[PDB]
Amino acid sequence: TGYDLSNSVFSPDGRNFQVEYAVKAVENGTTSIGIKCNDGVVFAVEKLITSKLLVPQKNVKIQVVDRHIGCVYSGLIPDGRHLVNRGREEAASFKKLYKTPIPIPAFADRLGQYVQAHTLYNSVRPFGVSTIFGGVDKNGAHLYMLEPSGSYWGYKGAATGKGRQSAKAELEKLVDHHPEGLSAREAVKQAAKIIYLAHEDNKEKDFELEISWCSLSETNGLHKFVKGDLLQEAIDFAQKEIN
Amino acid sequence: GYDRALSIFSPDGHIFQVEYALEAVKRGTCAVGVKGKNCVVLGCERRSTLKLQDTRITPSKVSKIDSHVVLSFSGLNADSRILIEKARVEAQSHRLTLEDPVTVEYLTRYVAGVQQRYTQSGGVRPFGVSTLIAGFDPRDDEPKLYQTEPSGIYSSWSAQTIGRNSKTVREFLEKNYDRKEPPATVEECVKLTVRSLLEVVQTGAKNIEITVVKPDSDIVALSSEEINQYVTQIEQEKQE
Amino acid sequence: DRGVSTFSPEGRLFQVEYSLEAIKLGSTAIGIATKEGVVLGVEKRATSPLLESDSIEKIVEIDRHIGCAMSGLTADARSMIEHARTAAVTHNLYYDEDINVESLTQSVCDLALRFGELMSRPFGVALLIAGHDADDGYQLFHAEPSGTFYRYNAKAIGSGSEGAQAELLNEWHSSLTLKEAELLVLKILKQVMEEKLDENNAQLSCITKQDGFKIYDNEKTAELIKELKEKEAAE
Amino acid sequence: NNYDGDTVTFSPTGRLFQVEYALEAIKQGSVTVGLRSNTHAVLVALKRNADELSSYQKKIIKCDEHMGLSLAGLAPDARVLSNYLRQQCNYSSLVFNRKLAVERAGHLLCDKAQKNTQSYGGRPYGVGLLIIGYDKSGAHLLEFQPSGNVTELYGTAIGARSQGAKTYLERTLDTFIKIDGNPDELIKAGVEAISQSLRDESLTVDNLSIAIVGKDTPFTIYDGEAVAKYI
Amino acid sequence: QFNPYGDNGGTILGIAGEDFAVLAGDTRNITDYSINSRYEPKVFDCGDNIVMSANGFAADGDALVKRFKNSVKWYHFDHNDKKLSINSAARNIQHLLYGKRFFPYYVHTII
Amino acid sequence: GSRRYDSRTTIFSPEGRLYQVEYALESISHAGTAIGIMASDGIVLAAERKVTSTLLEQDTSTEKLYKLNDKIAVAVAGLTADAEILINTARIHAQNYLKTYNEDIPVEILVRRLSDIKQGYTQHGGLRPFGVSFIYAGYDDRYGYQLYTSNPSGNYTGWKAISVGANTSAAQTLLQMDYKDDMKVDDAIELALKTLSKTTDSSALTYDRLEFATIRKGANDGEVYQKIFKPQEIKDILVKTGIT
Amino acid sequence: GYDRHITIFSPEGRLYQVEYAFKATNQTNINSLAVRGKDCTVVISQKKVPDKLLDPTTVSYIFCISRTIGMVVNGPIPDARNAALRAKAEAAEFRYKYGYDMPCDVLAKRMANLSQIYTQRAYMRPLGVILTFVSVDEELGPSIYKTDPAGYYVGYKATATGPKQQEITTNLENHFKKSKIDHINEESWEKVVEFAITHMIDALGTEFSKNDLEVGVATKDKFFTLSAENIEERLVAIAEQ
Amino acid sequence: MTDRYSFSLTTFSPSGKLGQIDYALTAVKQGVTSLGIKATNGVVIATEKKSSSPLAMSETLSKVSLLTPDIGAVYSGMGPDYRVLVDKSRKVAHTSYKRIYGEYPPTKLLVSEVAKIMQEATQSGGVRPFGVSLLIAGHDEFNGFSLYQVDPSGSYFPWKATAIGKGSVAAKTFLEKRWNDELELEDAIHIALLTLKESVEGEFNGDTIELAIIGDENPDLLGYTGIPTDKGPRFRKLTSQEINDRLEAL
Amino acid sequence: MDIILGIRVQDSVILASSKAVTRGISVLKDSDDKTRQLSPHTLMSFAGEAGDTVQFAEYIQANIQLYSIREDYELSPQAVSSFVRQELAKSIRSRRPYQVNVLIGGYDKKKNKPELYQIDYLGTKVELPYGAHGYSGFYTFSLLDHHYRPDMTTEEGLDLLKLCVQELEKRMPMDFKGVIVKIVDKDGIRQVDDF
Ligand SMILES: [Cl-]
Ligand SMILES: [Mg+2]
């Protein structure tokens, strides 16, 4: 055989094993989530505290693209950065030509086509991240998840990393118990809970929580981080629910 | 462009492509160079599994690079044409910019440099050629003989041989060449050159070529008859 | 096969490590640094008696204040010397001053790792770069194909190096005169050389602040060789 | 095993072996320590000689007046990366009249290292770096690894036996973090930290290397008789 | 047509003593018959005890000084914090200026 | 990456040979035999077609013999497609020389440049060599009538008589036996055909399995003519020598 | 056998990477179907939304390439979108260069030529997709043209693609044996859509809700996709029959 | 990224065969039979329209293609490879001939250009050979009627008549029996239809057979009148009806 | 530069070329040889734009010398003239053309005939019994039209040349400091030392 040694080779069953091996690196990473709300989206991520020596609050992982898009990813951290740098170039180019900020579905395909391009040749390696991203445009809120194969869809809620299954289950309950909708401030709290709940799958090290959000009403449609009173308030809500 | 590193190091610190290029040189027809008191002689074996040859038009083994310098070789013949062309172009370029023809050392150093370059450039293999380069520097009467090889190392020789059975003829030259007293005349130097080839060749028929180079661009090819005289005289003296 | 720019599991570049083996096969080169100058000596090693040994150029001038000796695949050194000379002369053109010995060495060492799939392989030759400058005085540097260079009070490279280096460890002191250093190089060369040392199969050189880099004639080295035997006979 | 031929290949468990082998060169490197208070940040580095006749390989390189690093692994790779960093600090000055944020310096190093881990024919960098700097938001320490991962810390150490110094700093955290407005005391805490990683050898005058940057102290290097103060 | 040059006026003056040197210049900056600034310095400390002024077209003068200051910075990086001598600075500046021989810096320079 | 699939066409064996050149020569050894014989008053080119079918259009065909210019022709042994690439190159190169110097190209210079192109494919570029060996027959006013051969290595040599392709060993011994220096064209024609007759892997030599060309001084005083024989003309020359 | 990893011939004259790309075609486990009316061309494809967390509106394998041309893809979505974006670009460039709307069959040929290159050139892999192009061409009328990873393409009276493609194919073959004509002899596209869904139900032996299907319709001067509500209207009309 | 395959994918094996050309020919062997016969006043080329499904419209798939108004081509082997070769062959007739001399290339020279393209795919970096053999029939003023075969190696040969693909060995034998130098065009069409029936298994009619001729000029197919020295294309694809007419009198 | 003449007689080609090199109001040199030997039986005189002349001559000389070595054979005058014409014909449509006019005098050893080629900077070649470049021709062509005969000896050709130089010294505005005369025949190239 040897079908799995080179990227872009089809195996006899029709698979690209290199892309599938990239997924293993994603599954190995920390948990990250996204929750779509009434007029926005919320992103959250688990940051493992490797040591006391890590400066708290000072190794930020969620990334903004343009002024209205948030991106978070699980897997190889530098690969995610490379993808966001590309996303930023794509958004700048779109804005430059068409004036309006890039629509989220439009932005999703730009990452999609770029990631997919890294499955076409054996001279490149596929991306070692699954990326959850989204924001608010003229058509409302959008949440997307994008995988190493370049595959992406829109989501009500999404999760990836070591705690992906715990978080998926927890997300399904929210979707089922809130058919009418979930508010932004609500979604910030749930996000915190789900990260704390998905931390069971990663529990030698204790962690640092990190949330961000775009909401038409709460952030004016811009991407902002959640800190201070609102973050602690959401941390406390999560602390309550695990006991 | 084709990029591959073909010449690379092996765990023992050898570059096999350079060393295999030397095997190609070993398989080549023998060539010898001997420098006298006042001349340098280049001698070349021509393999004798080939009759119906046309010698008028077949590439001669010794090539003029400039009117005062010659180059012979052992190894791949097609490879040697590439080196000979470059050297000829460099010879004319040197005259154009320095207003003086190349020294034998300079021309040797250039050819050696080309060979070395092909041992650490991507996409190319080394030259399967070693050269003997001989002549006289402008306005100088001291004879010069240099050797190059696929690796790109070059050096000066009182006399030297390359190609197949070169070890046999080097053995001969080593016990027959006195540093203290080099072949005093053209006559003498040509004779020692033919004798050494006769340790290896066959008959000195359509098998030995000889080229004499004297100072001031005085370079002539010897022909069958005159070589035959040397072959004849050498054997009749040898019957002791 | 497997790429030219590959790491071993020990965390070393295969090609760089293999070039180090090629350098061990090379002829011996020794350098010693004193307050009065730096001496550079090499084993010529003619592969046959018919080869005219003064055509073996293994000690080389880079500028008036910098000299260089080599060991390994010596054909690979041509372009390193060419670069070194250009860098030294270019520096003088840009700054109306002598280039520092360390800066020259660093410039040569930048070439080293510019190989891969740029040139196709590392250099198969190590260099001893010796010189003087106003700021740091007399200096000796060992430049490897790894791109690393070390300053040495004394250093040997090539086939006889581990034996020669251990000898230099004992014999070097901070008050060596130039003459003492010349004899040491000759002494240690005769020790590690296969054939018997003489003025034809070994070569000496030095660089002094006053007279710059000089290769010694065969007559001058012959007298030092004769002098070396007399000092050893006398105890 | 079958998947370590080049950087463009993933293993079946999702690992990049060429990157991991590059990481291994750091582990063979001589130890170096970084740590910082709120006012200063210090690099301490153990230098390695070839033998008794040789000089001690420099481990600390200055990037700007307010930033610099220490290295562990392939030295020429650190020279490449430090040169890139000098250029980036310089571009920030000339174009924006702005001292380069230590955090941005981290991001730029991360993205430079990463491109060599995803393309055919290249190779990962074989060196780890500790970046200290004093910028518009105080003192900073960064740890760079050639996987691309850059991390901001109060303190750390990399190289051979770096674990000794790293546990010491992990213990000493609350003390050294508050050595504000005292250069000599923060350095002492750094020298004490590196000492936990020493074996069959101790710190000498031409063996030890220290660098400090802070509120009113440009990034400067101390070697030779200027480190005798701390042995 | 677009004229890439201008004249910002001012004048500079350098004198050398036995153990000192001075470099003076006025602080006025002008275009045509208007004053732009009454205090805009054009004599700069460039490090290593070198002072420099490039008088004429200010944009070109600022660019050159900026480039030389940068040249000093890299001289230190590349040559072990060595001090750039005044004679070596002069020669470096010759290459800075001559590199634009076919689109010159419109300045009279003194160091 | 792609290094995995690289055959490395331009490397040495441990014995110092070029694999791809060796194997190209092995390819050529199964090609229809081509013979060149040079006389004092002209040159003969004769070559055997690879086993013809009766339905092949024999007169509109050219597989073995090609016109490079008015004074130079080649006989091909190997891959036809490869040979046409090199032939057009040679045709252009001859025209460049004429344009530059206002003189027809000397035979060796044309030969050397084609041989140099072949050489390049063995030393750089990572491509396979051209699986072709040529016999060059031509005239110029310096050396008169000339025969050369070149092979995939880019090595070329001059000849009085030579064969390439299949059964060269047998053919070369037969030529070496009956060739004399003072020979005429019509004697050379006879030798060429009689040699193919004895070395062929066929039952017997017929007009339909042959290509034939001469370069004589046969026109009007001190000027040269190339004659690519038509089928009917080969048929006659076969009878006129008593092979049919 | 490195002849199985890149697009070079095997000893039996085969391209295994092309063959394995055909197998990726069915990875999504979706079946598609296309038919022609008098005035229109209809394409239907199954819509399977497994995860509840997905936004069902973003899950689609039908694409609007130009105002007149629609395309359904059978294969993984990354390759599908790669082909869609390219086809959109090619259709736009054609209009700009030649001053008229790119025809369905010409776009099909162009994408087929692009696919052919990947079967011949080694550095490019084939896309694991089959592309069914539909329109009402201004010269040729209702049109279906389909492209595969081999670079093959041809026009169809009707066609189907997917795991249970053969069942649907013979179902349609049998209708055209009986009907004796090249198309669905129907006035409105609504009834041609109804035909398409009906014969999909018979051949697959399964029932569909509004969210189990995906429908594209091409009329003169526009191709458009139906909403769930438009499909529900269509399903209801079939049930009342 | 970028095509890093700059080296040959076709190379000589120790025996001297070029594997990929050999395997390309094997792909041609598997292909459907096609043939050509050369009459005194014309040339015929023919093949089977082997459909993939009865739901396919086999008129939309043209195996016989016009290259110039007096040159046509047919193939056996891989269809998509043939399609791009026809595209490239049409363009090269213009770029490297018509735009230079103001007239269409003669058959042999166009054939020569196609062969060049195919040879390059046998030696250039990072490509496989074309998996087809072509039969190219054409007419030009100075050479008259002609027929050529072009193989994956880039080799071409002129033929009186021949066949390629599936049942070529049998078909070539049947043509040796029937071919003579006095054949009129209609006689060659008749022989072509007979030779082809041997290799076709299923239906044999004007909808399953593709057949074109290089014959007389067709002013009715020119598109315009008024220039009497312009007389129209010699290439004509026979209609479904036209073929059936000749199968009644078979 | 300025004055270059050529006369082809029965058995030789004679080239005469002025010795002056002027810049501004100063004659910088009065012994300049405006000629390069291309091969042993081919000589080229030149005149035109300063710098270009010598640069062009030496470039051609280098190329012909390279050919001679490569083939161990001397190109015919006709072949060399064609090579030189092509280079000038190239040059005239370059970014900065060689502004050089030349005369090529050679003895063809295969034909045993002298040949004189006049080529201007545009690449305009003609073979002539006698030729000149620049203003010189305005006097010498008509003079030679009268006095020249096809079967003249080298000695007769030299006297015919003295007539040309005498006329130019009488009627030309500039002082060109005499000429260097060179003969090309079956025995190669030699210089007349007193003219
Ligand atoms: Cl296309
Ligand atoms: Mg491919």
XYZ file of N, CA, C and O in Angstrom, chain F residues 1 10 16 25 42-43 64 73-74 87 91 93 109 115 137 140 142 144 175 181 183 190 205 210-211 219:
104
model
N 7.495 14.795 -0.321
C 7.025 15.426 -1.593
C 7.204 14.543 -2.818
O 6.946 13.339 -2.763
N 19.908 11.256 -14.645
C 21.252 11.756 -14.931
C 22.255 11.457 -13.815
O 23.019 12.341 -13.428
N 30.607 3.844 -12.883
C 30.848 5.066 -13.650
C 30.211 5.065 -15.028
O 30.812 5.537 -15.994
N 20.701 2.817 -25.472
C 21.476 2.048 -26.455
C 20.910 0.638 -26.637
O 20.902 0.104 -27.750
N 31.440 9.804 -53.435
C 30.094 9.887 -52.863
C 29.889 9.083 -51.592
O 30.825 8.480 -51.068
N 28.651 9.095 -51.096
C 28.271 8.377 -49.874
C 26.958 7.636 -50.100
O 26.070 8.138 -50.788
N 13.365 6.271 -41.833
C 14.781 6.035 -41.578
C 15.675 7.176 -42.062
O 16.575 7.600 -41.342
N 22.419 14.648 -44.906
C 21.280 13.790 -44.572
C 21.637 12.888 -43.396
O 22.815 12.729 -43.063
N 20.619 12.303 -42.769
C 20.830 11.374 -41.660
C 20.020 10.095 -41.807
O 18.906 10.114 -42.330
N 15.855 16.373 -35.428
C 16.027 16.733 -36.839
C 15.628 18.186 -37.108
O 16.371 18.917 -37.761
N 17.846 21.081 -38.476
C 17.442 21.832 -39.667
C 17.492 23.339 -39.413
O 17.991 24.096 -40.247
N 19.249 24.826 -36.952
C 20.637 25.168 -36.652
C 21.472 25.364 -37.923
O 22.350 26.230 -37.965
N 30.270 20.709 -37.560
C 29.667 21.707 -36.673
C 28.204 21.364 -36.378
O 27.769 21.434 -35.226
N 24.974 16.558 -31.043
C 25.610 15.724 -30.032
C 25.691 16.438 -28.678
O 25.563 15.803 -27.631
N 25.389 11.609 -43.116
C 26.082 11.605 -44.399
C 25.989 13.003 -44.992
O 24.892 13.529 -45.165
N 30.944 18.948 -47.374
C 31.318 20.362 -47.338
C 32.667 20.542 -48.035
O 33.380 19.568 -48.274
N 35.500 21.676 -47.102
C 36.714 21.553 -46.287
C 37.211 20.110 -46.248
O 38.380 19.844 -46.518
N 35.269 17.439 -47.702
C 34.578 16.646 -48.709
C 33.515 15.754 -48.093
O 32.785 16.177 -47.196
N 31.475 -5.253 -43.245
C 31.961 -4.003 -43.841
C 33.479 -3.925 -43.757
O 34.148 -3.611 -44.738
N 39.575 1.552 -49.554
C 39.601 3.024 -49.569
C 39.333 3.656 -50.940
O 38.698 4.708 -51.021
N 37.364 2.727 -53.200
C 36.028 2.315 -53.638
C 35.259 3.435 -54.344
O 35.478 4.616 -54.067
N 26.446 -1.509 -53.722
C 26.445 -2.969 -53.741
C 26.826 -3.564 -52.382
O 26.199 -4.522 -51.933
N 15.658 -9.892 -48.569
C 15.545 -8.441 -48.699
C 14.707 -8.077 -49.925
O 14.978 -8.549 -51.031
N 12.879 -1.338 -47.484
C 14.129 -0.585 -47.580
C 13.933 0.908 -47.819
O 12.974 1.333 -48.464
N 14.864 1.691 -47.280
C 15.050 3.086 -47.655
C 16.497 3.246 -48.101
O 17.394 2.592 -47.563
N 25.730 15.628 -60.361
C 25.081 16.678 -61.148
C 26.102 17.411 -62.040
O 27.067 16.797 -62.500
